[PDB]
Design a protein around this ligand. Structure first.
Ligand SMILES: Nc1nc2c(ncn2[C@@H]2O[C@H](COP(=O)(O)OP(=O)(O)O)[C@@H](O)[C@H]2O)c(=O)[nH]1
Ligand SMILES: Nc1nc2c(ncn2[C@@H]2O[C@H](COP(=O)(O)OP(=O)(O)O)[C@@H](O)[C@H]2O)c(=O)[nH]1
Ligand SMILES: [Mg+2]
Ligand SMILES: [Mg+2]
Lengths: 269, 273
């Protein structure tokens, strides 16, 4: 009997893979948001190693948690461990793609999406964050996210989202969705809304559940009330959730393959 | 009874990375120590120069010149080596001034005192351990001024998060030999030690919320932050510990801060001069 239960836990073939990474200083809620993402589609220690966690939704969703980077006294080249991980998956894929083993289906561990967490300071972006995002954008789709958005009043949040958008433009930071890859009027219309209003996504994370309106929901219980993570009246996690998992999942993979990976392959060959 | 002149000068400096509510708390300190007033509309600009703001304050009937020194943030660059040197320089510049002035060739009855008596070091509520830059920065400052660690934006935390983080900060500071005020080395007897043990092990670091804006709560206007869920009241002990910090620095330990500054820190400067 005990043996019989073991095979059941072993287990689900999937049609495709999607891989998201979270990146930024320690203490910004990255690991919490990883768990939040997983609990939206079904104490946390400091993260000391890059770790990939997968779950079947059929698709295999992998979320890659990372140690804090860009939070030290000296941060020169602090992006290199992340770059190394990303390029390792490109190299893996390159060799799998030649396909000597003649598989029908090729495993894809490449990072299709990188959530870059920005601390909610109210002020101009850190030069370090600008530099970090610049290096990452060369090799992966970057999506800027404002961490711990419950830190901000409504006015502070609007002001800061606008500041971040302006400073990304001024500094020439490539982030997804890139205007360069808008196909038509429908894409330009939807993506302009995303670029100019929705982004950067101001999120709150929690893997704790509370009953609100007689329903179990993800929420953050502060001493002043329960912040409902998936309620758009409370934060923008649901906008981020739907953007990455529903509306632009396929687009993120296509840019990853046809642009970032092809750039890797070009340089490799 | 009461007179126009101030009894003494008291100088507080706020230090920490940008975006931690430092400049806001500067404004909060002055507003808590004072009328019907319209709230600030414009955002406080990023602080890019060291700036001393002074006002005559009353506290328990006595007038003091309270100066709060606002400072630029740090830690936001690729390379933050030696980012404490500008603050160290200001602190030493005041010691130097006092040294040149205390000779008192002008025969003044009172000597103007611009020395930093108290330095509030703001720590981001990160949940884990301290940031290495913060540890190093505090380690350097603790050798030349009185440091009090403060958890910034404490409304960021749940009650359990706040409790654990306070302990983690204390443990980190102790393991690293960081002698923040009240320094154990200067504990003079058992009564002193028993009392300062409580401060070091329970009171500190203070978890604060800052706001120089006022909102009506149950018929009274109070300092607070207006969130979608409610008003976080800065001077309410049930909401945060700003009131404890203010009372500690302005009333109960003000003179002790000044004495440690003059008899220890300033004397070490003067000896090394
Ligand atoms: N205020 C606030 N705190 C959060 C949020 N998400 C996580 N936290 C807390 O922030 C601290 C660090 O979270 P963690 O997930 O470990 O961050 P990481 O170091 O970036 O992985 C913990 O105390 C969390 O409970 C959030 O959305 N808002
Ligand atoms: N959540 C929270 N935000 C605060 C607090 N105090 C200030 N702020 C906000 O934090 C941002 C930066 O404040 P500022 O005083 O300029 O910080 P400084 O750069 O350290 O001087 C502003 O949006 C403030 O309104 C606080 O106690 N809690
Ligand atoms: Mg983590
Ligand atoms: Mg400031």
């Amino acid at each position: 009997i005990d043996t019989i239960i073991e095979q059941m836990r072993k287990k689900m073939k999937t049609g495709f893979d999607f891989n998201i990474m979270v990146v930024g200083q320690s203490g910004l809620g990255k690991s919490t948001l990883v768990n939040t993402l997983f609990k939206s589609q079904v104490k946390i220690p400091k993260t000391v190693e890059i770790k990939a966690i997968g779950h079947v939704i059929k698709m295999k969703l992998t979320v890659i948690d990372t140690p804090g980077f860009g939070d030290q006294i000296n941060n020169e080249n602090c992006w290199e461990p992340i770059e190394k991980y990303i390029n390792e998956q490109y190299e893996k894929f390159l060799k799998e793609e030649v396909n000597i083993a003649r598989k029908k289906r090729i495993p894809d561990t490449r990072v299709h999406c990188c959530l870059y967490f920005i601390s909610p300071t109210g002020h101009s972006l850190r030069p370090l964050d600008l530099e970090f995002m610049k290096h990452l954008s060369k090799v992966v789709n970057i999506i800027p996210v404002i961490a711990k958005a419950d830190t901000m009043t409504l006015e502070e949040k609007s002001e800061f989202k606008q500041r971040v958008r302006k400073e990304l433009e001024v500094n020439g930071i490539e982030f997804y969705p890139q205007k360069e890859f808008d196909e038509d009027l429908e894409d330009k219309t939807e993506n302009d809304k995303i670029r100019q209003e929705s982004m950067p996504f101001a999120v709150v994370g929690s893997d704790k559940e509370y009953q609100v309106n007689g329903k179990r929901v993800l929420g953050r219980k502060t001493p002043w009330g329960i912040i409902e993570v998936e309620n758009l009246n409370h934060c923008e996690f649901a906008l981020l959730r739907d953007f990455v998992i529903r509306t632009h999942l396929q687009d993120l993979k296509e840019v990853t393959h046809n642009i970032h990976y092809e750039t890797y392959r070009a340089k490799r060959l």
